[PDB]
From Swiss-Prot:
Acts as a class I viral fusion protein. Under the current model, the protein has at least 3 conformational states: pre-fusion native state, pre-hairpin intermediate state, and post-fusion hairpin state. During fusion of viral and target intracellular membranes, the coiled coil regions (heptad repeats) assume a trimer-of-hairpins structure, positioning the fusion peptide in close proximity to the C-terminal region of the ectodomain. The formation of this structure appears to drive apposition and subsequent fusion of viral and target cell membranes. This is Transmembrane protein gp41. Residues 1-21 are annotated as: Fusion peptide. It is found in: Virion membrane; Host cell membrane; Host endosome membrane. It comes from the Viruses. The mature envelope protein (Env) consists of a homotrimer of non-covalently associated gp120-gp41 heterodimers. The resulting complex protrudes from the virus surface as a spike. There seems to be as few as 10 spikes on the average virion. It is a single-pass type I membrane protein. It comes from Human immunodeficiency virus type 1 group M subtype B (isolate BRU/LAI).
Amino acid sequence: AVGIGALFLGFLGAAGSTMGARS
């Protein structure tokens, strides 16, 4: 299927990106 292990665990998780904020 479509990158489950790649977005969360890999890109946000292992590496780093900004998903958002609360404010």
